[PDB]
Amino acid sequence: KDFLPLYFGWFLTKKSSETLRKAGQVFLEELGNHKAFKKELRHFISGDEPKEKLELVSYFGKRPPGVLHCTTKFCDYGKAAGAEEYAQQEVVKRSYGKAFKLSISALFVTPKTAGAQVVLTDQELQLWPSDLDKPSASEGLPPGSRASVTLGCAADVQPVQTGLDLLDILQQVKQGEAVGELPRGKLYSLGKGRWMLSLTKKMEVKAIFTGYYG
Ligand SMILES: Nc1ncnc2c1ncn2[C@@H]1O[C@H](CO)[C@H]2OP(=O)(O)O[C@H]21
Ligand SMILES: [Cl-]
């Protein structure tokens, strides 16, 4: 009669998390100042905003307060569908507490979330859930495409939206030239307020697989 974690995932170390967090911040500051982005503001925000400049760091005001993480399976202590099934797996139990490296291939921004795209290894993909209830946007994409790290959310958006935004982006990119060059890579405008920075060099972040309890 033991209950599960709120969710399973890879939790970044202090050092790796700050490295990614900082890169995310720089991206928001650079994107917000980029002429291509400014030009499309009316596709990013939809209201009485002045033509003046939008600071994305402020826009994505809801940020993780501490270390960052890549969620694998949200369990809600066993109440989520597929939770018990996921937790019972040998590979989950065996991997519990193990160290991993996550490959970050891109940073992205939408009107709802700012995040980082994670490219899971085959070993890490074994820890990705295979549920009966799937996000419709995951269909047609490689397993684990949803893998991401939440860097920030718009005021009325929940962190879960980040992975869903990535799936939408990946559905979209499944490409035209980049519309800009930032120091860390090429900048793509995917439309509908969506932006992806494709990192010239993938970031590697160290993380531990474990379970979070609220
Ligand atoms: N229904 C869900 N499916 C997948 N991930 C979820 C779900 N609900 C919440 N999360 C994620 O679990 C964490 C606790 O809220 C948090 O980390 P995240 O991956 O940034 O989005 C959230
Ligand atoms: Cl919303």
Swiss-Prot record:
One GO MF annotation is:
2',3'-cyclic-nucleotide 3'-phosphodiesterase activity
Q: Which coarse location class describes where this protein primarily resides? A: membrane
Q: Where does substrate bind?
A: T71, T150
Q: What Enzyme Commission number does this protein have?
A: 3.1.4.37
Biological process terms in GO annotation: adult locomotory behavior; axonogenesis; cyclic nucleotide catabolic process; oligodendrocyte differentiation; response to toxic substance
List the catalytic activities from the record. Answer: a nucleoside 2',3'-cyclic phosphate + H2O = a nucleoside 2'-phosphate + H(+)
Chain segments annotated as transmembrane: none
State the annotated membrane topology for this chain: Lipid-anchor
According to the UniProt record, list the residues that bear Phosphoserine. Answer: S46, S58
Keywords associated with the record: Hydrolase, Lipoprotein, Membrane, Methylation, Phosphoprotein, Prenylation, RNA-binding
> Would the keyword Membrane turn up in this protein's UniProt record?
yes
Subcellular localization is given as:
Membrane; Melanosome
Any one annotated GO CC term: membrane
Q: Where does the record place the catalytic residues?
A: H69, S148
Assembly with partners or alone: Exists as monomers and homodimers.
What protein family does this chain belong to?
Belongs to the 2H phosphoesterase superfamily. CNPase family.
- Stated name of the protein: 2',3'-cyclic-nucleotide 3'-phosphodiesterase
Per the record, the gene is Cnp
Full-protein residues shown:
182 to 398 of 420
